[PDB]
Nucleic acid binder design. Structure first.
Ligand SMILES: [K+]
Ligand SMILES: [K+]
Ligand SMILES: [K+]
Ligand SMILES: [K+]
Ligand SMILES: [K+]
Ligand SMILES: [K+]
Ligand SMILES: [K+]
Ligand SMILES: [K+]
Ligand SMILES: [K+]
Ligand SMILES: [K+]
Ligand SMILES: [K+]
Ligand SMILES: [K+]
Ligand SMILES: [K+]
Ligand SMILES: [K+]
Ligand SMILES: [Mg+2]
Ligand SMILES: [Mg+2]
Ligand SMILES: [Mg+2]
Ligand SMILES: [Mg+2]
Ligand SMILES: [Mg+2]
Ligand SMILES: [Mg+2]
Ligand SMILES: [Mg+2]
Ligand SMILES: [Mg+2]
Ligand SMILES: [Mg+2]
Ligand SMILES: [Mg+2]
Ligand SMILES: [Mg+2]
Ligand SMILES: [Mg+2]
Ligand SMILES: [Mg+2]
Ligand SMILES: [Mg+2]
Ligand SMILES: [Mg+2]
Ligand SMILES: [Mg+2]
Ligand SMILES: [Mg+2]
Ligand SMILES: [Mg+2]
Ligand SMILES: [Mg+2]
Ligand SMILES: [Mg+2]
Ligand SMILES: [Mg+2]
Ligand SMILES: [Mg+2]
Ligand SMILES: [Mg+2]
Ligand SMILES: [Mg+2]
Ligand SMILES: [Mg+2]
Ligand SMILES: [Mg+2]
Ligand SMILES: [Mg+2]
Ligand SMILES: [Mg+2]
Ligand SMILES: [Mg+2]
Ligand SMILES: [Mg+2]
Ligand SMILES: [Mg+2]
Ligand SMILES: [Mg+2]
Ligand SMILES: [Mg+2]
Ligand SMILES: [Mg+2]
Ligand SMILES: [Mg+2]
Lengths: 185, 51, 148, 54, 125, 219, 49, 158
RNA sequence: GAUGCCCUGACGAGUAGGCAGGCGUGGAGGUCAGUGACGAAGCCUAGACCGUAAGGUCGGGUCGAACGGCCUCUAGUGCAG
RNA sequence: UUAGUGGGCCAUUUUUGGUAAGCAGAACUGGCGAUGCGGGAUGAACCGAACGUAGAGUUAAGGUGCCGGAAUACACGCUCAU
RNA sequence: GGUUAUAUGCCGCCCGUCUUGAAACACGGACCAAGGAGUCUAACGUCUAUGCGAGUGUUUGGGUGUAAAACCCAUACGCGU
């Protein structure tokens, strides 16, 4: 016998591979597993872990978010890398030049980047240009902006959204939501 | 692949501890202490034997 | 498909995953929303506050078309010019040949003011406008023409 | 028929499985319950310090 | 004529027979685990049948080898043989139960030419 | 590639020379300390005084009870001393902070004051390092130098020196040793019933210098 | 029958609803018929639109 | 039936000390609390206003708010398997500065001196406290102190 | 065969229950130009082999017209009560 | 995010009702329930000790006349019971 | 050496079930075959995969067809912005 301080046979609880059966994503993972092992660059370890993430943990990155990032001081000529999809945003007018590396470009995003003189590249083309992540800038989309997150942690006084199909005057605005009808929240 | 005990395997003893060759040669496990002629005080003995 | 369900993995385990003690009986707790003010009060108060009781005034025979007024922010707005013609109009910022943007034709009923437009005059036809949307269009040298 | 009424037997064991977590501290706690007169001024003070490091 | 292997150890030769397959005709011998609340087999009281468990697994070096040292490979025709042309030390061919007597003579002749061991050469003879 | 073997053989030779001189020094240090305690006891006797020896600085602790039916407080203390299995043992630096721990776990442990002989035999026979969360046998001086080199400690005999003198890097040396895994004692425990105090003719609690006979039979 | 944090639902199946389920398996058939009837009508009425 | 009012079970807890009834001495009112100060809560039963609930008796916390007559204190209360933060509004008669902190600060100061003194003098100083150590060796003389022999005594009745 | 190969260390009780990897059955798409009246399927067999096991395979007897392996799809898919 | 559960019971110590109970009711811990294994002849809970499959060694608790593996061991006394 | 039957030593209560507690003087079970119990649907929550992305959804319908398939599509409408 052994007085176990921890739980035995506990899996790490991190993905160690994409759950996806996309062949081409599996090739990207074969590449970045190689570079992460054989270089010392922190970048490659990060990009490798990002290729494992589920769709909800790879939120899209608009081109306005890329544009905002290149306004950072000393950042205008960095390769922006998005381990995921770059979407268009018609809320910006002037987009800078720049090279963006990503898994996917929407048709509109690829148009807007190219029209400004830029270049959209795959993550394997990034590997050859920047094997040690040289001169890159990793961007992540916003995670906590999903509709589902509005509803997490629902409870008295917590200020979260109820799970509700129909909204209006008659749907969950009475006893419990105002002092005049029993009490508020 | 196989833990050898220094305390049995003489080769492994020497690997871990180069002084073991010296220690054995000079027989430091059986060192004679130098004779001294110290005697306890009366008081020490008188209390030792006291009823 | 049936071959991936846990029904298949419970084959041989007596209770089908429902317990020896408690069991899978018919409707312990009552059917549907039974008991919302009695034995299900805690759930209802925690996750559906506001569920019981009335607020506000009735409206008999409400027709939703009366309330049709879809909103467009200025943020967008230039989206309503087609992408071919957009780039020329932005570089040729002219009080003499400003683009007309019929926001009703596009299927909108009110221009709201979120965000920033280019400093390029535009004629905006709309049913309604916010106060700030109008200020921003005029500050770019535009006008709001009201229509019906 | 009659049953057991109450016991805390087994409750500390249950409590210690996922441990008794100390409540987690931040630089900058909420100014919540702090005197409103103080808070109202403090806004005005912080405003001026921004307009000064500029 | 096999690849040299370690002495093949079987940790448990005895078949795992279902509890009470000896007592009732209705209960077949095919292993089933007792799930019952009071079962002496489930609970592992001294004196009762042992249950299959992963500790009895065979050494990976010798798992699947027959006593000859070859792994068996079911063959139905000459083209199925001849997958084993270059693997004679590893694999032995077993002719499938449904091959006709006339087609067994063909498969066996070709087996001899290629030096493939056949595990069941006396079948249908 | 001869010069790679040459330079490695050179540097190795140099490392063994250093180990040789240190081990010779420790030998002297131990013997002088031993004889100075003996002469101090004689000199006091001669003067009609009593030499009161320094209080012990190091205990060795063995867990003597299994892992069922231990109350929460001693169960936590036992985990803090890395004693999570019957017959596992560790060294403990004595202080008020550690003495009050040993009080709490007295019914579950045997402990006392280890000699150099006992420490030498434990580390040579049953010494394993904690390297990268793994239990690795101390089969070469290189293994020790790689992990304790930053604190001096280049060899198994330096590691022993740090333990027995309760050196300034005791903590780090002592934590590096994986808890010793002893057998049951080879001629038994010497008593019909273990689970009473040594003083009452059981096995548990502080048995001072008699820990050495016990542990030598367990190792 | 209330539990967890789920939407309140409004599934109206408290009548004998299985007596009146209409599955539109004839979708493809009704399209062929409608087309034949356009063709037949076109012939009867020709050359009119 | 059972009874669990706000002051249930306080009979002894809120009693005044013996011969220490009556008016609160003035030093209680001249103490100055500042946000971040660590205070110990101990209800004065003579001041019924601003009084802590009996659970907080003997608990220490941090001042988070200062008002006319009172301070806000934060306490961590264990509820179930976790600690919730509680915010109490106590009149100052029920509070006192914790001397735990007062005597820690004296050590921070003393350490600063020692460290400065060590650099200028140009050596190296130990600033961690140590647990009480095993005694070192020592010679005890018997000069005017010859050991006196004791024996166990027989049983007597009284 | 990179879902591969390999090195190192630790660990292994379990009802209710959870999840995982597998075995088996009727039928469907694909494939093996698969097996078969020179004997398919079924059944019997203190004969043999493989698998921790679900199970798989082979020989012998009986028999007479169909049936299997693998990659997938699908369910009226596994019994001691 | 979701399962099961929401009849408990026992031992040491603290403890209430009761003449008491293998009774009723609380406190802290350890257990049984959910658990085999060595010991207590036997036994849910006691003692020891918690369990992948094997080999060797050593032990725990309990034992060593015979049943029964192991001294009809050694030592000082006490005890003869119709 | 395997298997099998037997002998010998030691060990081994009857499963399933409800239960704090079953070998129970608790319940079901004489035996065997075959059948025999978490399904489908409407609307949903979390999570995951996939497509496209400020959009998205061809299948009400129309066009076409090797004809319930496959292929193509306007206007709306839904959800989202
Ligand atoms: K183990
Ligand atoms: K379940
Ligand atoms: K009742
Ligand atoms: K009750
Ligand atoms: K087929
Ligand atoms: K629950
Ligand atoms: K519940
Ligand atoms: K037990
Ligand atoms: K027993
Ligand atoms: K023991
Ligand atoms: K007998
Ligand atoms: K035999
Ligand atoms: K029952
Ligand atoms: K009955
Ligand atoms: Mg189960
Ligand atoms: Mg049931
Ligand atoms: Mg239920
Ligand atoms: Mg109850
Ligand atoms: Mg009551
Ligand atoms: Mg077998
Ligand atoms: Mg049971
Ligand atoms: Mg012996
Ligand atoms: Mg004993
Ligand atoms: Mg009362
Ligand atoms: Mg009042
Ligand atoms: Mg297990
Ligand atoms: Mg069917
Ligand atoms: Mg046949
Ligand atoms: Mg038979
Ligand atoms: Mg026929
Ligand atoms: Mg069925
Ligand atoms: Mg049956
Ligand atoms: Mg059953
Ligand atoms: Mg439930
Ligand atoms: Mg209840
Ligand atoms: Mg119940
Ligand atoms: Mg009772
Ligand atoms: Mg139960
Ligand atoms: Mg007895
Ligand atoms: Mg005997
Ligand atoms: Mg034999
Ligand atoms: Mg028996
Ligand atoms: Mg009963
Ligand atoms: Mg039973
Ligand atoms: Mg009975
Ligand atoms: Mg009944
Ligand atoms: Mg009956
Ligand atoms: Mg019947
Ligand atoms: Mg059947």
């Amino acid at each position: 016998g052994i007085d176990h301080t921890s739980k035995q046979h506990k899996r790490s609880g991190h993905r160690t591979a994409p759950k996806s059966d996309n062949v081409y994503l599996k090739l990207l993972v074969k590449l970045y597993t190689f570079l992460a092992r054989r270089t010392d660059a922190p970048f490659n370890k990060v990009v490798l872990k990002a290729l494992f993430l589920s769709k909800i943990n790879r939120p899209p990155v608009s081109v306005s978010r890329i544009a905002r990032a290149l306004k950072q001081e000393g950042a205008a000529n960095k390769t922006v890398v998005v381990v995921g999809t770059v979407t268009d945003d018609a809320r910006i007018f002037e987009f800078p030049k720049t090279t963006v590396a990503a898994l996917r470009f929407t048709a509109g995003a690829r148009a807007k980047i190219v029209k400004a003189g830029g270049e959209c590249i795959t993550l394997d083309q990034l590997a050859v240009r920047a094997p040690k992540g040289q001169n890159t800038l990793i961007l992540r989309g916003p995670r906590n902006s999903r509709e589902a997150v509005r509803h997490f942690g629902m409870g008295p006084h917590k200020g979260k959204a109820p799970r509700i199909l129909s909204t209006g005057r008659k749907f969950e605005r009475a006893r419990g939501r105002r002092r005049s009808k029993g009490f508020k929240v | 692949v196989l833990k050898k005990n220094p305390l049995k395997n003489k080769q492994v003893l020497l690997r871990l501890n180069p002084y073991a060759k010296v220690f054995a040669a000079e027989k430091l496990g059986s060192k004679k202490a130098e004779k001294t002629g110290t005697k306890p005080a009366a008081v020490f003995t008188e209390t030792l034997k006291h009823d | 498909p049936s071959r991936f369900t846990k029904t298949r993995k419970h084959r041989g385990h007596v209770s089908a995953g429902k317990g020896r003690i408690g069991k899978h009986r018919k409707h312990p707790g009552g059917r549907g929303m039974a008991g919302g003010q009695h034995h299900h009060r805690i759930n209802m108060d925690k996750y559906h506050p506001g569920y019981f009781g009335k607020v506000g005034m009735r409206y008999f025979h409400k027709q939703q078309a009366h309330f049709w007024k879809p909103v467009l922010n200025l943020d967008k707005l230039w989206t309503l010019i087609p992408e071919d013609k957009r780039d020329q109009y932005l570089k040729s910022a002219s009080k003499e040949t400003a683009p007309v943007i019929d926001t009703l034709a596009a299927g909108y009923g009110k221009i709201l003011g979120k965000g920033r437009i280019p400093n390029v005059p535009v004629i905006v036809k709309a049913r309604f406008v916010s106060k700030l949307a109008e200020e921003k269009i005029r500050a770019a040298g535009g006008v709001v023409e009201l229509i019906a | 028929a009659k049953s057991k009424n109450h016991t805390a037997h087994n409750q500390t064991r249950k409590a210690h499985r996922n441990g008794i977590k100390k409540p987690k501290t931040y630089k900058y706690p909420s100014l919540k319950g702090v005197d409103p007169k103080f808070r109202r001024n403090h806004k005005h003070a912080l405003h001026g310090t921004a307009k000064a490091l500029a | 004529a096999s690849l040299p292997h370690p002495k093949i150890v079987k940790k448990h030769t005895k078949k795992f027979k279902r509890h009470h397959s000896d007592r009732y005709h209705r209960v077949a011998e095919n292993w089933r685990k007792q799930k019952g609340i009071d079962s002496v087999v489930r609970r592992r009281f001294r004196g009762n049948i042992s249950q299959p468990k992963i500790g009895y697994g065979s050494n990976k070096k010798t798992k699947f080898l027959s006593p000859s040292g070859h792994k068996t490979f079911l063959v139905a025709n000459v083209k199925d043989l001849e997958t084993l042309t270059m693997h004679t030390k590893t694999y032995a061919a077993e002719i499938a139960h449904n091959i006709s007597a006339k087609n067994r003579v063909v498969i066996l002749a070709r087996a001899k030419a290629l030096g493939i061991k056949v595990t069941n050469p006396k079948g249908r003879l | 590639v001869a010069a790679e073997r040459a330079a490695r053989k050179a540097a190795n030779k140099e490392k063994r020379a250093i180990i040789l001189e240190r081990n010779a020094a420790y030998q002297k240090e131990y013997e002088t300390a031993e004889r100075n305690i003996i002469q101090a006891k004689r000199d006091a006797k001669a003067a009609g005084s009593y030499y009161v020896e320094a209080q012990h600085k190091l205990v060795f602790v063995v867990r003597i009870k299994g892992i069922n039916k231990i109350p929460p407080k001693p169960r936590k203390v036992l985990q803090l001393l890395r004693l999570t299995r019957i017959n596992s043992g560790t060294f403990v630096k004595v202080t008020k902070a550690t003495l009050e721990l040993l009080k709490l776990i007295e019914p579950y442990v045997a402990y006392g004051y280890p000699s150099y002989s006992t420490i030498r035999q434990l580390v040579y026979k049953r010494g394993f390092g904690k390297i990268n969360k793994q239990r690795v046998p101390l089969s070469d001086n290189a293994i020790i130098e790689a992990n304790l080199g930053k604190y001096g400690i280049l060899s198994i005999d330096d590691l022993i020196h740090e333990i027995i003198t309760v050196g300034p890097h005791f903590k780090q040396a002592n934590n590096f040793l994986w808890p010793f895994k002893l057998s049951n004692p080879s001629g038994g425990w010497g008593v019909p019933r273990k689970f009473k105090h040594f003083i009452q003719g059981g096995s548990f609690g502080n048995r001072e210098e008699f820990i050495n006979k016990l542990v030598k039979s367990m190792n | 029958a209330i539990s967890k944090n789920l939407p309140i639902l409004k599934n109206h199946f408290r009548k004998h609803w299985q007596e009146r389920v209409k599955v539109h398996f004839d979708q493809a058939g009704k399209k062929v018929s409608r087309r034949n009837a356009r063709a037949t009508r076109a012939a009867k009425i020709a050359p009119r639109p | 039936g059972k009874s669990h009012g706000y002051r249930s079970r306080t009979r002894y807890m809120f009693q005044r000390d013996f011969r220490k009834h009556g008016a609160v001495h003035l030093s209680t009112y001249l103490k100055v609390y500042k946000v971040g100060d660590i205070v110990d809560i101990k209800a004065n039963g003579s001041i019924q206003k601003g009084m802590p609930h009996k659970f907080y008796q003997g608990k220490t916390g941090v001042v988070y708010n200062v008002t006319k007559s009172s301070v806000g204190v934060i306490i961590n209360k264990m509820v179930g398997n976790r600690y919730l933060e509680k915010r109490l509004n106590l009149r100052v008669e029920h509070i006192k500065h914790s001397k735990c902190r007062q005597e820690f600060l004296e050590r921070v100061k003393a350490n600063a001196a020692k460290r400065a003194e060590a650099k200028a003098q140009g050596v190296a100083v130990q600033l961690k406290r140590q647990p009480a150590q095993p005694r070192e060796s020592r010679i005890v003389s018997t000069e005017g102190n010859v050991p006196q022999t004791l024996a166990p005594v027989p049983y007597e009745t009284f």
